[PDB]
């Protein structure tokens, strides 16, 4: 029939501020109509790499829930938002499973997220004792112990604060420019699937 109540993709993609990659925002999208052709046919995205599904049949298939994870990383760190990759972002900030079904959408945001003095409002975790599990969030701000001595909560020698700020200037290279990344995770569960595509008339 005639379809209304579109899924809130404006509050994910067109958000005024994005989260840091260590504290990446997850929005659960349910009980609405998800039009994926609006995103795929946009010219504003640099990466639209879909894993486990093709973009053409997204607008047909139906899913139980959609997880929209949003964060900001560097240009050279977009490749680590993929199954099976290795780096600071994949190991310590945001880990994707190998058996991942969904799409990784990234675009350059040097216009918004870079200021002439330097935008240091975006943080990333630099050290953790072990690699993250898939879809894990670590927001702990406890001092990393690289040495045998106890840190005792103070950043001294062999003891570092694990969260480090991104330096974003508008004159940086494209591998250092900020990129807003939205990862959509599609799962089907035994509950009735309610996030369906638009139906043609």
């Amino acid at each position: 029939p005639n379809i209304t109540n579109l899924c809130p993709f404006g509050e994910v993609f067109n958000a005024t501020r994005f989260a840091s990659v260590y504290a990446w925002n997850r929005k659960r999208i349910s009980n609405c109509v998800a039009d994926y052709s609006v995103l795929y046919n946009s010219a504003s995205f640099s990466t639209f790499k879909c894993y486990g599904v093709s973009p053409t049949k997204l607008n047909d298939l139906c899913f139980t829930n959609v997880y929209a994870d949003s964060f900001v990383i560097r240009g050279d760190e977009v490749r680590q938002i993929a199954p099976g990759q290795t780096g600071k972002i994949a190991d310590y900030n945001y880990k994707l499973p190998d058996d991942f079904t969904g799409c990784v959408i990234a675009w350059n945001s040097n216009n918004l997220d870079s200021k002439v003095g330097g935008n240091y409002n975006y943080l990333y975790r630099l050290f953790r004792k072990s690699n993250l599990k898939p879809f894990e969030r670590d927001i702990s701000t406890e001092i990393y112990q690289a040495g045998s001595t106890p840190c005792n909560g103070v950043e001294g020698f062999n003891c570092y604060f694990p969260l480090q700020s991104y330096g974003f200037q508008p004159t940086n290279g494209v591998g250092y420019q900020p990129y807003r990344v939205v990862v959509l995770s599609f799962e089907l569960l035994h509950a009735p699937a309610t996030v369906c595509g638009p139906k043609k008339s």
Binding site: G118, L126, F127, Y144, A146, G147, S148, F157, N158, Y160, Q164, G167, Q169, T171, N172, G173, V174, G175, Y176
Partner: protein, 596 residues
């Protein structure tokens, strides 16, 4: 856990913090250089002090990780680079004295203004007031006046300053477990810990002498030819048996002989390869110059310039209102920001300089994947050599005909190749004995081989013995004749030009063999060759991660600097000079036969 993992995490923290702090310092230095204003000077000084203080605090943190318990070569290289004390090992009073001495030598050299006694109402600075006189005058006593007056004022100011400088730098170097400051400079080529590819600080002097002994016949023939031509230019001053008078070499110090090309041209009747008029006729902007250079670098397979390069570089003189340094400089500011600051004119020299500085930019872009403290050349010679090879390839008549700047009906006979090779020898071969003699003199001064009361007696003795250049009148020890040059007065290593010159032709033979050029080496162009660009980029991507001996193995297949590619490059000119020197006498006499 282990010491190596501790050092690796510390290096990660250092890299992340240092890259942003270095970017702030480099951006402040850029804003000073493109806009010379006092608040920009203050901002530059504040950023530089923050960067130096951060390096002091990180070196202090870095020393607590001992070197011999780390086995990974890259981690050990970054820790070796970070754990150098620098001037920090010296006492605070002596460190302040050394910094004050360096700054006041910089001000004396930069703001040194000299003019004729009894005519003091206006005076000429070194650039361009004295440079133009040295490069264009044909008068013996005018050039003699300019040379002696500038070495009188500058040397008599700088001699006690240099006497303090040598003692302070030797104290800092022996405090840093070096033999002298010369050993500290030779430590740039020191490779330790790699099996087979190790290079020692003491091997550098032996290799430089061994290469210069093979340089010497070509330089002797070139010196005899230049002596005969300068005898024609100045009839009575120059002797057939003696050295060249010092103030007649076309530059202030004798650094290059390229301003004697008009006097010493073999075949003036034949045309030149000057393409200046052709670009003026086609209205080539400096933007077009850099785009043609970019076309050259994409033809060989190297990456093209970033968008930030075209947006943020200053490739034209800004105007009267905005002040900028005119010297062409390629800037690796950090965080993927690459810029060129050049006041580009429509000349061949500026076009070749654009190729040279974009070669510097390509070298900087290639090791951007490396860690921050390994983002350098493998030695100081490679960084300049990779720009000079682009200057070699772009200057060829094949490249000029290919891009349309030269007429397709230009006749390339042997005479034009001889005079082009002679111009390249006056630029390239003529700087080699001057460079070697200057570095050997500075090494003997730092080593204590030359006492302070005997600096000039030895120096002119070295110049007569090596460079074949005689002083016009004798100088006592109140003069400081070496420190009138930019690099020695401002604490810069000088062997980088000698090593650059040899690495230039070694890289040229390697890339021309890669490009399958089948003629003379000076007729070779490395455009359109993907494999030559790949062989170049294999070394370019390493940066300082690998030893320079291994990088040289990656390019030319040799573990050491070699002199035979240079001699192969100038072999037609060498045979021509041997033919032309039948009547004249090759070699010089160290006696005072021309003038003293």
């Amino acid at each position: 856990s282990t010491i190596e993992e501790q050092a690796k995490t510390f290096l990660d923290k250092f890299n992340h913090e240092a890259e942003d702090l270095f970017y702030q310092s480099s951006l402040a230095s850029w804003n000073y250089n493109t806009n010379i204003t006092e608040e920009n000077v203050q901002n530059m000084n504040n950023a530089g002090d923050k960067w130096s203080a951060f390096l002091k605090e990180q070196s202090t943190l870095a020393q607590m990780y001992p070197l011999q318990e780390i086995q990974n070569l890259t981690v050990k290289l970054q820790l070796q680079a970070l754990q150098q004390n620098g001037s920090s090992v010296l006492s605070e009073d002596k460190s302040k004295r050394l910094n004050t001495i360096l700054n006041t030598m910089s001000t004396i050299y930069s703001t040194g203004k000299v003019c004729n006694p009894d005519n003091p109402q206006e005076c000429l600075l070194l650039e361009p007031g004295l440079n133009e006189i040295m490069a264009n005058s044909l008068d013996y006593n005018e050039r003699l006046w300019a040379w002696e007056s500038w070495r009188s004022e500058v040397g008599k100011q700088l001699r006690p300053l240099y006497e303090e400088y040598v003692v302070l730098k030797n104290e800092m170097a022996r405090a840093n477990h070096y033999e002298d400051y010369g050993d500290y400079w030779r430590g740039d080529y020191e490779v330790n810990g790699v099996d087979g590819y190790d290079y020692s600080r003491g091997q550098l002097i032996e290799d430089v002498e061994h290469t210069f002994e093979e340089i010497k016949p070509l330089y002797e023939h070139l010196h005899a030819y230049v002596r005969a031509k300068l005898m024609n230019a100045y009839p009575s001053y120059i002797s057939p048996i003696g050295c060249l008078p010092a103030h007649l070499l076309g530059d202030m110090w004798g650094r290059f002989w390229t301003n004697l090309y008009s006097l010493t041209v073999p075949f003036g009747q034949k045309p030149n390869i000057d393409v200046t008029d052709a670009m003026v006729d086609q209205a080539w902007d400096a933007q077009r110059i850099f785009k043609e250079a970019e076309k050259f670098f994409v033809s060989v397979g190297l990456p093209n310039m970033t968008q930030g390069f075209w947006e943020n570089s200053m490739l034209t003189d800004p105007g009267n209102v905005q002040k900028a340094v005119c010297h062409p400089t390629a800037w690796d500011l950090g965080k993927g920001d690459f810029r060129i600051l050049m006041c580009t004119k429509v000349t061949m020299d500026d076009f070749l300089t654009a190729h040279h500085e974009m070669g510097h930019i390509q070298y900087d872009m290639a090791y951007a994947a490396q860690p921050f403290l390994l983002r350098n050349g493998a030695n100081e010679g490679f960084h300049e050599a990779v720009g000079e090879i682009m200057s070699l390839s772009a200057a060829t008549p094949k490249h000029l005909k290919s891009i349309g700047l030269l007429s397709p009906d230009f006749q390339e006979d042997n005479e034009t190749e001889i005079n082009f090779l002679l111009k390249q020898a006056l630029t390239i071969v003529g700087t080699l004995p001057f460079t070697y003699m200057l570095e050997k003199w500075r090494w003997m001064v730092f080593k204590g081989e030359i006492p302070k009361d005997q600096w000039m007696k030895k120096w002119w003795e070295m110049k007569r013995e090596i460079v074949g250049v005689v002083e016009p009148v004798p100088h006592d020890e109140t003069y400081c004749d070496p420190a009138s040059l930019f690099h020695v007065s401002n604490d810069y290593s000088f062997i980088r030009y000698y090593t650059r010159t040899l690495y230039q032709f070694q890289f040229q033979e390697a890339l021309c063999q890669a490009a399958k050029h089948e003629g003379p080496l000076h007729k070779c162009d490395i455009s359109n060759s993907t494999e030559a660009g790949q062989k170049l980029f294999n070394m370019l991507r390493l940066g300082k991660s690998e030893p320079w001996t291994l990088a040289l193995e990656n390019v030319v297949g040799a573990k050491n600097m070699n002199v035979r590619p240079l001699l192969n490059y100038f072999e037609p000119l060498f045979t021509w000079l041997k033919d032309q020197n039948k009547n004249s006498f090759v070699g010089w006499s160290t006696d005072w036969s021309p003038y003293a």
